[PDB]
Design a protein around this ligand. Sequence first.
Ligand code: HEM
Length: 392
Amino acid sequence: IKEFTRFKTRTEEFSPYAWCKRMLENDPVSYHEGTDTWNVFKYEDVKRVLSDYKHFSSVRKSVPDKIKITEADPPEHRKRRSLLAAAFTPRSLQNWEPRIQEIADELIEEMDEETEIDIVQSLASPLPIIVMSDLMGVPSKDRLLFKKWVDILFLPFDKEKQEEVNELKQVAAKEYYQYLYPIVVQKRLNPADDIISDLLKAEVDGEMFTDDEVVRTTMLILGAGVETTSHLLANSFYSLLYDDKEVYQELHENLDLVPQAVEEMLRYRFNLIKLDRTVKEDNDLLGVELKEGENVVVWMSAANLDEEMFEDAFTLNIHRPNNKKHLTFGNGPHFCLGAPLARLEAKIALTTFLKKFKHIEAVPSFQLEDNLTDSATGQTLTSLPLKACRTL
Ligand code: HEM
């Protein structure tokens, strides 16, 4: 990432609109000598690379093998995805809503009007983690223990840390495994409505998981869904405090708008997300002769800001007809399997908050350049304080 983007400040990277703008207009398909990648930005072209597995492929450049789902095209992808999709059935999802609600209620009841609330510390970070501990079937008594390891492994470093992180991660990995494996063993014998039990009962094309593979699969799932869901929640409150005064009140008066607002956040405020493909059959299609083996990186963050697809692309507009056509969850066969959940967590989180709080206020003293740390998405809020106002 760093070797191509090169932002002078953390604030530039948290809000990279100008950079996306100028790439979309002045360099929509740029080669980069220093990393040996092509770089695609336009919406129609990004969508073509993500979906056309035949010309652009997910095979490229420990994790079970039968579940390296990202790293396979049709037709062997179908096997890997069906295997994992056993834990993400519409039945489970239906059951998850009330359990996601209770957790949201607990966290929001714990916030008080009188003080400044830190949204990252008190909602954006713990909700995805507490949620995933629940849907996994970790006992509530061990929830805080789970959170300790999930933090370290999966939440964007701490603020000040270095390469002794790699050692801290290695330990958390070892302790997580020690902790979870016996729960997997016990759910093999005595199953319940949770991801672990469903992964154990999964059979697809004569493949079943070992207990060890189930454990490593939960790490995959946490690794896919915690940083990302945390980031969406954080940036959703960021946007409500700084991008448009009125949007909060608007949602407060019409709670049926929350899902649209989530979609507009995925479009406009899920910044720097990108994906990788390798070329497997030569083509123009983009308007440059690409050869097999070259690395195409796509920048969905930018695609989501292409004026061709989105009217007033650089403006937070929750009423824009086609917000939901954003590429933040991908497109084509690899479309985020966790989208239903992620959309669900965000709707519940926001809705529950809006029901308790009529107004929110940004703290004048808040310096955005402090309070940002490096991550897989670019930068990410380590803190976000607000003042809020009870009832209606
Ligand atoms: C805001 C939240 C999230 C975003 C923006 C997001 C985004 C994405 C994107 C862009 C991909 C496509 C990867 C590719 O094409 O190479 C993807 C794949 C995936 N995501 Fe997510 N994700 C989110 C949350 C989750 C959650 C919560 C889970 C699981 C609980 C999850 C599980 C997955 C899985 C398994 C895949 C791979 C599916 C496949 O290759 O067939 N994600 N995600």
